[PDB]
Design a protein that fits this description.
The complex is a heterotrimer of chains A (213), B (212) and C (469).
Chain A: E1 4-7, E2 10-13, E3 19-25, E4 33-38, E5 45-49, E6 53-54, E7 62-67, E8 70-75, E9 85-90, E10 96-97, E11 101-105, E12 113-117, H1 121-124, E13 128-138, E14 143-149, E15 152-153, E16 158-162, E17 172-181, H2 182-185, E18 190-197, E19 204-209
Parallel strand pairs in A: 2-11
Antiparallel strand pairs in A: 1-3, 3-8, 4-5, 4-9, 5-6, 7-8, 9-10, 9-11, 12-13, 13-17, 14-15, 14-18, 16-17, 18-19
Chain B: E1 3-6, E2 10-12, E3 18-25, E4 33-39, E5 45-51, E6 57-59, E7 67-72, E8 77-82, E9 91-98, E10 103-106, E11 110-114, E12 123-127, E13 133-143, E14 149-152, E15 161-163, E16 167-168, E17 174-183, E18 193-198, E19 203-208
Parallel strand pairs in B: 2-11
Antiparallel strand pairs in B: 1-3, 3-8, 4-5, 4-9, 5-6, 7-8, 9-10, 9-11, 12-13, 13-17, 14-18, 15-17, 16-17, 18-19
Chain C: E1 3-5, E2 10-13, E3 19-24, E4 30-32, E5 40-43, E6 47-52, E7 61-66, E8 71-77, E9 84-86, E10 90-94, E11 99-101, E12 103-105, E13 115-118, E14 127-130, E15 134-137, E16 147-154, E17 157-160, E18 164-169, E19 177-181, E20 184-188, E21 193-201, E22 207-212, E23 215-216, E24 221-225, E25 230-238, E26 247-255, E27 258-269, E28 273-277, E29 283-287, E30 292-301, E31 306-311, E32 323-326, E33 330-337, E34 346-354, E35 357-380, E36 383-393, E37 397-404, E38 415-421, E39 425-428, E40 435-442, E41 450-457, E42 462-467
Classes of the chains: A mainly beta (213), B mainly beta (212), C mainly beta (469).
Bound molecules: a molecule of 4 linked components (NAG-NAG-BMA-FUC), a molecule of 2 linked components (NAG-FUC) and 2-acetamido-2-deoxy-beta-D-glucopyranose.
A molecule of 4 linked components (NAG-NAG-BMA-FUC) binds at residues 306-308, 310, 319, 351, 353, 358 of chain C.
Chain lengths: 213, 212, 469
Amino acid sequence: DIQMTQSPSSLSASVGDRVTITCRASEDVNTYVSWYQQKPGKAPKLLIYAASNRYTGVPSRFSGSGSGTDFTLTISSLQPEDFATYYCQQSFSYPTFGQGTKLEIKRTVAAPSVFIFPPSDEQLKSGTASVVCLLNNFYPREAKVQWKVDNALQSGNSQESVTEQDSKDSTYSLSSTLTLSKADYEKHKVYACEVTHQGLSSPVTKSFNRGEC
Amino acid sequence: QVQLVQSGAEVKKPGASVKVSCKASGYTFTSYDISWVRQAPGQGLEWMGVIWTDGGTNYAQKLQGRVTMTTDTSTSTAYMELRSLRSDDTAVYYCARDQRLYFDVWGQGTTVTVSSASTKGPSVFPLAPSSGTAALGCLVKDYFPEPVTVSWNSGALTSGVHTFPAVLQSSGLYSLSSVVTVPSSSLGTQTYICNVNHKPSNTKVDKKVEPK
Amino acid sequence: IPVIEPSVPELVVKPGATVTLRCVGNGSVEWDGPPSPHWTLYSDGSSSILSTNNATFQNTGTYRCTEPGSAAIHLYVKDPARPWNVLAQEVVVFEDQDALLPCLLTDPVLEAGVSLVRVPLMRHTNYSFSPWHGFTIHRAKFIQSQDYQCSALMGGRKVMSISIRLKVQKVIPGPPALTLVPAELVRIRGEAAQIVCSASSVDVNFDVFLQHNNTKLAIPQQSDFHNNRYQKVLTLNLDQVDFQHAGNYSCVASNVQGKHSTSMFFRVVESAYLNLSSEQNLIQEVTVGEGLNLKVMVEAYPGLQGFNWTYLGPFSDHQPEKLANATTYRHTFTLSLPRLKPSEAGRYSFLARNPGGWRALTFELTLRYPPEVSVIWTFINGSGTLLCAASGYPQPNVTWLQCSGHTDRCDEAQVLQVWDDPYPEVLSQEPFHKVTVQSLLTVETLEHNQTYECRAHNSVGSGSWAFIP
Ligand SMILES: *[C@@H]1O[C@H](CO[C@@H]2O[C@@H](C)[C@@H](O)[C@@H](O)[C@@H]2O)[C@@H](O[C@@H]2O[C@H](CO)[C@@H](O[C@@H]3O[C@H](CO)[C@@H](O)[C@H](O)[C@@H]3O)[C@H](O)[C@H]2NC(C)=O)[C@H](O)[C@H]1NC(C)=O
Ligand SMILES: *[C@@H]1O[C@H](CO[C@@H]2O[C@@H](C)[C@@H](O)[C@@H](O)[C@@H]2O)[C@@H](O)[C@H](O)[C@H]1NC(C)=O
Ligand SMILES: *[C@@H]1O[C@H](CO)[C@@H](O)[C@H](O)[C@H]1NC(C)=O
């Protein structure tokens, strides 16, 4: 199958910026290349087909170029709607897509406000303990959370989730959950989440002592 | 006007089959081919195959022998059946109008969940505030299948609300959190209740979040 | 000197109008104009006619008529929205050379409100304007290597042309700048040929000569001084060529800063030729849904008078158009066949023709298919029989499975019996079609809680059909 290699994988830009996304085919695909825009929870939308042909109802700020193996998509002046995922597709042989390019809003650095939540007494009664660490409204997306249970760092007992970039302030939020059994939770005292971000000179540790309130 | 409307979300056990429908409107259905494209959570787009206007089919090599694409000329409906389902078949399934060199019209997608898990209602636990602004929330734990809807004060509280994407646990159940950042002064006057809905199990829970 | 009709130095027409520029001479007359395919050229013994039914702003330019063995008219097509006809968007000169930016004004009435803009205002630039030629940047400096636009004042508002990019090259030392036209030549014994070897320099002291197979030719040189450069041109005219004229022609130029050389090969042939070939086998086999490009290489002399791609193949005759080409004595013709459908299998013929005759190359395209399986219950001579039909290319094999319970696929645990039919009855085996095979399974008694699956395989894939009564 023909591989479609997209560059970059991620792009940060501001409203008004000119943005270029490239795509390379593992073999010659003539001009049988299309560009799709996809926003979360929505289906993809056709932007360009025949390498440079704009589809009906697509604004003039979107343009396509290329022949053979190297193709480009250009958005000449970014509008707030333009922030989405863009995919290139070849239709010379079995249809294949590029891995995507995420286009997000470039804004000023904002450090996360860290919050830790001990497990509720209602939860502990069922026999499990979920410790939650909240990283509120930060920029850029890149943040790190480490769990510490009595200065012992933890591997494989936590899951994290991130919100989409905020429509208002263009920030991100993260939630990490540490799951232990009631037996395991009561073997230790100090529960801590250690946060690393660009908006921080040194890692922020928010913690609690089990029993103490 | 020019649309393809897909059938609702599906939940299946490994080894079962799923048959997804896709109804055309606004154009001569029999004049264009129909392709099915799938997208796994957090992943890219994967073409599954085409059904031509003549009735013929060309399936993606990876799904050959396991996938069937059909059409119903009378109802302008395209169908896609996928057999011997496995966990990695969990994806959003799209039908799209195949103009050979591009997919111009797309269906809204059909979520297909393949899991050995059974319908289970969630457990809503508070995320009580510690001590300017404070954060409080809810932990919606151990539910199947997706989704859950979460509201704060029955829609009255929207500003500063963050409902995080569901996380799939090793157990096969899902878990999520909804947090909100309110002023510290309001913790002794205002009442905060998170409203959690899980239609698949008919679980409607209203949980009051207060400090310890 | 030839005579032009209309006998005026310049002409102004509106877009849409019919323009007819007729040149008449004692012998043959030759027109040389900037746009095509806009102009329809008709040419006889004494005359040549440039014609158009729909005048476009792109028809604006100077039309020069020459009698080989000069006269000109300037046409202006006054487009109320298009004041500029840009001939080239790329202009390259050396430093201290005058650069012409070919912005052709479509209305002579506009001249005094015309200005050169640098995409926007330039620095210390000396320019003049010509309504016929465009702007000239005098003694081009290295700093003047930028993107310019031409402004025309229409209704008190500035109207810009498409950007013209100026590239001013640094004048470094070295042997004189070389030119050899043509880069390649092919002629039939008895025809005429022109080989022009020229050299330029900023200094008048330099030598230039044309050599044929390392033997210097006695060509008289035409020395000139044009655009801050000295030129020496050697025109080699061969009245009637022969196998003695064939070979390597070298244009050699030298001065106090070196000796330089450029070459061309002149081929002399006994008669017109047309040779067709392909790097690809004419017999092609590809899987359905795959893309394919059918390429033919054409070495021809004189120029081709016609070429096409034809679908001969057994299915619906939708004809190519699809067809693209690159390179003039060599050409590659490519028929693009993206995501091949089953009706696109068959014969594709490429034909080319020139004064030497016609030639064709025919490709045979066979498509591969994974198996498609159908199972039905029938009665052959009173006995109950399960009939399995499997279609695909190459020819598939068949396998029967009987298993406990109602299922889409019989599993190792539920499977009660297996019958293999590696070579079933061949039902249909026509070229550019799927091969259809048939397996019959006589079933004496068929129970309730069971299903009969027929699986078929070939090199491309697998197909299946489970039968539950
Ligand atoms: C592709 O072109 C070929 C050749 O035609 C010539 O070259 C082309 C590049 C163009 O310049 C054409 O204008 C030019 O004619 C076409 O094939 C030829 O077509 C003619 C008419 O269809 C054939 O004539 C017929 O011949 C049979 C006997 O075989 C008679 O019974 C008929 O009465 C009739 O005269 C001719 O044989 C054929 N030539 C060759 C060399 O095969 C071809 O049709 C065209 N393809 C497409 C897609 O248009
Ligand atoms: C059936 O075929 C399988 C696939 O083999 C391919 O298809 C067959 C029809 C031949 O053309 C063969 O040369 C190809 O490689 C085999 O793996 C399988 O063993 C075959 N089954 C039996 C029982 O012969
Ligand atoms: C030398 O000239 C002859 C014709 O006079 C020609 O056939 C031959 O190819 C030339 N040699 C080379 C090396 O091109």
